[PDB]
Amino acid sequence: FAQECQNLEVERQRRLERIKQKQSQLQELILQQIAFKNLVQRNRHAEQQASRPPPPNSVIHLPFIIVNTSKKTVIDCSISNDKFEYLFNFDNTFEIHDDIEVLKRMGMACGLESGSCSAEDLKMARSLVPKALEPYVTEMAQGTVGGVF
């Protein structure tokens, strides 16, 4: 049934690609869940310790984006009337980072991005995720996420 077998095998490969994409998405969503919840509890606790919430200007709410370049790098800004459109010119390398990426580098995801968890990091991570997602977190902690189940 070689003809039918060809049809099943492309279907199989098509599903293998969907699963692979979904596994990455699942991971990322778990890391966001952990990171957001971790940030929120860091701030909740820091607002107890010496009361008075932080001054508005010293604080950036999510979502946001970061752009960094050398302090020397010439930047040319152009803005539309309504501030809907912007254009920046750079005379040197710059970097763009997401808030999630910032949160990860702050250690909000408990090192889970790269399996770099201490016992306490992992415990923290496990407690910020519902029980059903625990086994997957364990998978992420070991790097044994692939093999494509």
Binding site: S24, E28, Q32, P63, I65, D76, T93, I96, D98, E101
Partner: protein
């Protein structure tokens, strides 16, 4: 030499930002800006 992304994609953004960072990190053939020969914007 042209990467587009939407601020509203929980997937891809970071990796596409990192491809953006990849595209933009090597700066051998980049012209440096000169104060003379340019007409600076009106400081409002």
């Amino acid at each position: 030499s042209r990467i587009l992304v939407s601020i509203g994609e929980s997937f891809g953004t970071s990796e596409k930002f990192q491809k953006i960072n990849q595209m933009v990190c090597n700066s051998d053939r980049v012209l440096k800006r000169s104060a003379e020969g340019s007409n600076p914007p009106k400081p409002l």
